[PDB]
A paper describes a structure:
The action of histamine is mediated through four subtypes of G protein-coupled receptors (GPCRs), H1R, H2R, H3R, and H4R2. H3R is expressed mainly in the brain and acts as an auto- or hetero-receptor in the histaminergic neurons. As an auto-receptor, H3R modulates the histamine release by the negative feedback. Therefore, H3R is a potential target for the treatment of neurologic and psychiatric disorders, such as sleep disorders, Parkinson’s disease, schizophrenia, Alzheimer’s disease, and cerebral ischemia.
Here we determine the crystal structure of human H3R bound to a non-imidazole antagonist PF-03654746 at 2.6 Å resolution. To obtain the stable human H3R proteins for structure determination, the flexible regions of the N-terminal residues 1–26, intracellular loop 3 (ICL3) residues 242–346, and C-terminal residues 433–445 were truncated, and a thermostabilized apocytochrome b562RIL (BRIL) was inserted at the N-terminus. The H3R structure consisted of the canonical seven transmembrane helical bundles (TMs1–7) connected by three extracellular loops (ECLs1–3) and three intracellular loops (ICLs1–3) with an amphipathic helix 8. In our H3R structure, PF-03654746 occupies a shallow pocket at the extracellular side, with clear densities for both the receptor and ligand. At the extracellular side, the carbonyl and N-ethyl-carboxamide moieties of PF-03654746 extends into the EBP by forming hydrophobic and hydrogen interactions with E3957.36 and Y912.61, respectively. Notably, the fluorine atom of 3-fluoro-cyclobutane of PF-03654746 engages a hydrogen bond with C18845.50, and the amine moiety of pyrrolidine of PF-03654746 forms a salt bridge with D1143.32 at the bottom of the pocket, which is highly conserved in the aminergic receptors. In our structure, the electron density of a cholesterol molecule is observed around TM1 and TM7 of H3R. Especially, the β3-hydroxy head group of cholesterol interacts with E3957.36 through hydrogen bonding. Our functional assays showed that mutating the negatively charged E3957.36 to uncharged alanine or positively charged arginine had little effects on the histamine activation, while completely abolishing the PF-03654746 inhibition, indicating that cholesterol binding to E3957.36 might not be critical for agonist binding and H3R activation, but might potentially to affect antagonist binding and H3R inhibition through an allosteric mode. Indeed, the pocket volume of PF-03654746-bound H3R (calculated by the CASTp 3.0 server) was similar to that of the doxepin-bound inactive H1R, but increased by ~3-fold in comparison with the histamine-bound active H1R, which is in agreement with the expansion of the extracellular binding pocket in the inactive state of H1R. Together with the intrahelical salt bridge observed between D3.49 and R3.50 in the DRY motif, and locked state of Y7.53 in the NP7.50xxY7.53 motif, these conformational changes resulted in an inactive state of H3R in complex with PF-03654746.
Numbering used by the authors:
A (entry chain B): 1 to 106
B (entry chain A): 27 to 241, 347 to 432
């Protein structure tokens, strides 16, 4: 449920970013998303309580989160130059990476 | 979502028993309509209607959901998602709206007994009332499921899972919840209370030797009809109320006070009712004890 709660955090911060207007709000939301993502990456999904870390499913779960962290960091890069619009547009792509790669394992 | 190998093995076993129990139980009920043509009554047809819905929860709704709870993924395309959704929402409100109809038919048989006697063998009238019910049931969720995505300019349901496009729309959910719960619960409460008062009144009625003697026999029959109705209405109420009540509460706290697994537990309690009904018909009705005899143990002659 810490994985459930880290997913909670990803949701709340992604909507702040739709809703924001300045770079600081967008930055804080992403730094939060990132922390939650690194935390969620170390989780063992309920589905997988019975699998090795070298298991194809557990490597794939963790690669979904590599995509995500990296996408959050691209958007931090843009936010950390005051490009609020680019950084907000990049936030949409997070939704794709979540559904396609991570949501399976929840 | 989903479950480890060890847990899916224990849940699949249990999910399967429920499937077999629901399917066999309602097939047996339907085969008893075939065996015994004395079950050609409106009251009986209203119970047949409940057994059809129940058959379909077993044959269609539970089976398509099993893989989805076990693994967390709907693997059948959104097309089959919409059909399964329509049919699950349809069988829910149909069962509910049919308990209303059964309760009305029983209220007329005690409170309007002599008018009811003439109408009772009229199965064409019965089959037309059940059809109207299927349309009314469909109307509550059917169009909203099929149309919300286009009205809302696209789906908010990732290709992973299967939910009604209105399922995080609180405004729709509060008015559908409250209708779905109160229409049936207040109508059903009224008929049953009204049967109780009718019997209590006639019991305290002061009649001569033959009229009194004729009407304690007719009151013995009414008292039995009232038990029968209370038992099925109660067991439905206790299977259906948690799900109906939780939806009303999810919608009124905008999804912030009800964990997913509460309402997902409640699904099984409501679907479990479909296994139970087959056993209640012969427990509570002569006509079904007679039919099951004609089918399974006709040696009684
Ligand atoms: C004995 C047989 C006939 C009855 C079958 C009972 C089985 C099918 C029912 C009873 C309890 C139900 C579980 C109760 C709660 C949950 C939590 C929910 O989040 C996922 C489904 C799950 C895990 C249900 C799965 C199905 C379940 C195990
Ligand atoms: C947790 C895996 N996903 C689900 O359980 C989804 C929740 C879901 F959208 C759903 C299906 C059917 C209904 C309606 N059913 C009517 C009878 C019991 C519940 C829902 F309220 C919700 C299926």
């Amino acid at each position: 449920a810490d994985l459930e709660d880290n997913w909670e955090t990803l949701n709340d911060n992604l909507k702040v970013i739709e809703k924001a207007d300045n770079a600081a709000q967008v930055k804080d939301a992403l730094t939060k998303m990132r922390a939650a993502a690194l935390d969620a990456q170390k989780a063992t999904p309920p589905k997988l309580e019975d699998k090795s870390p070298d298991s194809p499913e557990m490597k794939d779960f963790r690669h979904g989160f590599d995509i995500l962290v990296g996408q959050i960091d691209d958007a931090l890069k843009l936010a950390n130059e005051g490009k609020v619009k680019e950084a907000q547009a990049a936030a949409e792509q997070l939704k794709t990476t979540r559904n396609a790669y991570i949501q399976k394992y929840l | 979502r989903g479950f480890s190998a060890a847990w899916t093995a224990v849940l699949a076993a249990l999910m399967a028993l429920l499937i077999v129990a629901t399917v066999l139980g309602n097939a047996l009920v339907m085969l008893a309509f075939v065996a015994d043509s004395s079950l050609r009554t409106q009251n009986n047809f209203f119970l047949l209607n409940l057994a059809i819905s129940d058959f379909l929860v077993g044959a269609f709704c539970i089976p398509l959901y099993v893989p989805y709870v076990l693994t967390g993924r709907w693997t059948f395309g959104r097309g089959l998602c919409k059909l399964w959704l329509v049919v699950d929402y349809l069988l829910c409100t149909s069962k509910a709206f049919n308990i209303v109809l059964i309760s009305y038919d029983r209220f007329l048989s005690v409170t309007r007994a002599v008018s009811y006697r003439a109408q009772q063998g009229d199965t064409r009238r019965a089959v037309r009332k059940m059809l109207l019910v299927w349309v009314l049931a469909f109307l509550l969720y059917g169009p909203a499921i099929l149309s919300w995505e286009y009205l809302s300019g696209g789906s908010s349901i990732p290709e992973g899972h299967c939910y009604a496009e209105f399922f995080y729309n609180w405004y729709f959910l509060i008015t559908a919840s409250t209708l779905e719960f109160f229409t049936p619960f207040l109508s059903v409460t009224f008929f049953n209370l009204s049967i109780y008062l009718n019997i209590q009144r006639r019991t305290r009625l002061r009649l001569d030797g033959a009229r009194e003697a004729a009407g304690r026999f007719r009151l013995s029959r009414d008292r039995k009809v009232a038990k029968s109705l209370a038992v099925i209405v109660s067991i439905f109420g206790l299977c259906w109320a948690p799900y109906t009540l939780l939806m009303i509460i999810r919608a009124a706290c905008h999804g912030h006070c009800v964990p997913d697994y509460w309402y997902e537990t409640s699904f099984w309690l409501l679907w479990a009712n479909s296994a139970v009904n087959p056993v209640l018909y012969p427990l509570c009705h002569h006509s079904f004890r007679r039919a099951f005899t004609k089918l399974l143990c006709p040696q009684k002659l």
